[PDB]
């Protein structure tokens, strides 16, 4: 209780420090954006997913890291499910446009994610080289990442992930039909309105051995996930000025920070990522939908039942993608059986000893 609240103080974003990064992040992102929007650029139609504010780009439990999506509203595309996860797809056009630059990235009828990302990376590398009023560099490509990560230092280093994405305003793929099970929690009108919004595809960028590995795209619901984080209560006034504070976000920050610390010491946890944590708490928020089940006075009790739920996902080797029920993020083919039992052992140790890793 007293220890968990003390850890949250160092994780909470100082509005004075996050504002100083807003000027630098916006300036660099805007410059790269207007570079992509030139006549020669094949990404001339690209736009920013979340525009206006700056907390939409910051990553929780990560004060110096930021995510930005560069979305491209392509013509009417047709999706082809690539293997039976429901998250990965080949992308074709219903009618290939005549003078569109995206045709340069076609491998037959399918749009090549890896070629688009390569040319995406080059245009970014060229523009950041011309940046001399602020030290900006392009980090080496992370395997499996759809993003071109920038390294900005003035004076402390901050990270900006520039994610390439296709925007589709068509209907969400059929694999999501039973996903987003928020009816008892956020309600059916929220779920209907959310599923009227676009969906996004990002390069899988995974050397999986398939013949279409460079043409594979992954479903992204980062916009829907951000909405849920900002609108996480059954009552509309949850965490508002005239409402009651809850500890949902604090439990997520604690769980995310507990995993990232365990990952820095043990390489056996490399297959785990913070998305497993956000997926797990989404299911927890669906299981415990009442705002009173997340009272800030029960912080320790709420953080403990999140750990127990997570350990239950490791034990059963089952963690369905919140938007794609058929996609088990904890299947053997994605995470080894020994890694789950290892993470379970370490979490039980931290849980039983007052979390010594937070010292
Ligand atoms: Zn709340």
Residue 200 CA to ligand 1 centre (angstroms):
27
- Structural domain that includes position 282: 1-13+172-198+221-359
Q: Are residues 70 and 89 in the same domain?
A: yes
Strands 62-73 and 157-168: parallel
The DSSP code for 215 is G
| 180 and 191 Cβ atoms separated by less than 8 Å | yes
Same domain, 105 and 194: no
The CB density around residue 132, as the number of other CB atoms within 10 Å, is 7
**Distance (Å) from CA 245 to ligand 1 centroid:** 5
CA–centroid distance, residue 95 to ligand 1 (Å): 45
Q: Are 128 and 32 in contact (CB under 8 A)?
A: yes
How many domains does the chain divide into?
Answer: 2
- The helix/strand count (H/E) of the chain reads as 9, 12
Considering the domain architecture, whether residues 238 and 339 belong to the same structural domain is answered as: yes
Q: How much distance in Å is there from the Cα of 251 to the middle of ligand 1? A: 11
Other Cβ atoms closer than 10 A to 291: 19
Same domain for 89 and 30: yes
Per-residue burial over 165-187, b = 16 or more CB atoms within 10 Å of its CB, e = otherwise: bbbbeeebbebbeebbbbeebbe
d(CA 198, CA 191): 13
Q: Quick check: bond before 108 cis, omega within 30? A: no
Q: How far apart are the first and last CA of the chain?
A: 14
Q: Are 240 and 232 in contact (CB under 8 A)?
A: no
Distance 183 CA to ligand 1 centre (A): 18
Ion ligand 1: residue ranges with CB closer than 5 A? 233, 238-239, 246
Which of 49, 63, 54, 57 is closest to 8 using CA atoms? Answer: 63
**Same domain (yes/no): 213, 263:** no
Q: What is the 309 CA–ligand 1 centroid distance (Å)? A: 20
CA of 57 to the centre of ligand 1 (A): 20
Assess whether 60 and 205 both reside in one domain: yes
Distance 247 CA to ligand 1 centre (A): 6
Same domain, 61 and 210: yes
Judge residue 34's burial from the number of C-beta atoms within 10 Å of its C-beta, 0-12 exposed, 13-18 middle, 19 or more buried.
Answer: exposed
Q: How far is the CA of 226 from the centre of ligand 1 (A)?
A: 14
Q: Are residues 118 and 251 in the same domain?
A: no
Measure 241 CA to ligand 1 centroid, in angstroms: 11
Q: How far is the CA of 232 from the centre of ligand 1 (A)?
A: 6
Residues 297 and 329 in one domain: yes
Give 291 Cα–ligand 1 centroid separation in angstroms. Answer: 7
Do 81 and 59 lie in one domain? The reply is yes
Q: Where does the chain have alpha helices with state H?
A: 2-11, 15-36, 113-129, 188-195, 222-230, 248-265, 274-287, 299-316, 337-352
Judge if 127 and 144 occupy the same domain: yes
Q: How was this structure determined?
A: X-ray
In angstroms, the CA 286 to CA 198 distance is: 23
If asked whether residues 103 and 187 sit together in one domain, one would say: no
Cα–Cα distance for residue pair 174/341, rounded to 1 Å: 33
The rounded distance, in Å, linking the Cα atoms of 8 and 73 is 39
Q: Which residues pair with 216 in a beta bridge?
A: 90
């Amino acid at each position: 209780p007293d220890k968990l609240k003390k850890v949250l103080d160092k994780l909470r974003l100082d509005p004075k420090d996050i504002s100083e990064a807003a000027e630098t992040v916006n300036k660099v992102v805007e410059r790269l954006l207007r570079r992509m929007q030139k006549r020669e650029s094949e990404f001339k139609g690209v736009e920013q997913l979340l525009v206006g504010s700056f907390y939409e780009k910051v990553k929780i439990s990560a004060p110096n890291e930021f995510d930005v999506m560069f979305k491209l509203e392509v013509p009417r595309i047709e999706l082809q499910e690539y293997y039976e996860t429901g998250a990965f797809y080949l992308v074709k056009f219903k009618r290939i446009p005549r003078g569109n630059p995206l045709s340069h990235f076609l491998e037959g009828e399918v749009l090549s994610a890896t070629k688009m990302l390569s040319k995406f990376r080059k245009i970014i590398k060229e523009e950041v080289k011309e940046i001399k009023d602020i030290d900006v560099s392009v980090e080496k490509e992370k395997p499996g990442s759809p993003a071109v990560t920038l390294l900005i230092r003035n004076p402390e280093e901050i990270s900006v992930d520039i994610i390439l994405a296709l925007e589709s305003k068509g209907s969400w793929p059929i694999s999501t039909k039973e996903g987003l099970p928020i009816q008892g929690w956020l309600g059916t009108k929220v779920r209907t309105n959310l599923r009227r919004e676009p969906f996004y595809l990002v390069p899988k960028n995974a050397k999986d051995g398939n013949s279409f590995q460079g043409e594979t795209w992954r479903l992204s619901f980062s916009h829907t996930e951000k909405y849920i984080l900002n609108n996480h209560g059954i009552e509309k006034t949850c965490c508002e000025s005239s409402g009651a504070k809850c500890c949902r976000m604090e439990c997520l920050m604690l769980m995310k920070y507990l995993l990232e610390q365990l990952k820095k010491e043990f390489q056996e946890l490399d297959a785990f990522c913070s998305y497993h944590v956000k997926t797990a708490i989404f299911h927890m928020w669906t299981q415990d939908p009442q705002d009173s089940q997340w009272d800030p006075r029960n912080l320790s009790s709420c953080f403990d039942k999140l750990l127990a739920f997570f350990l239950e996902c490791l034990r059963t080797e089952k963690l369905d993608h919140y938007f794609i029920p058929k996609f088990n993020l904890f299947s053997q083919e994605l995470i080894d059986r020994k890694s789950k039992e290892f993470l379970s052992k370490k979490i039980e140790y931290e849980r039983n000893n007052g979390f010594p890793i937070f010292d």
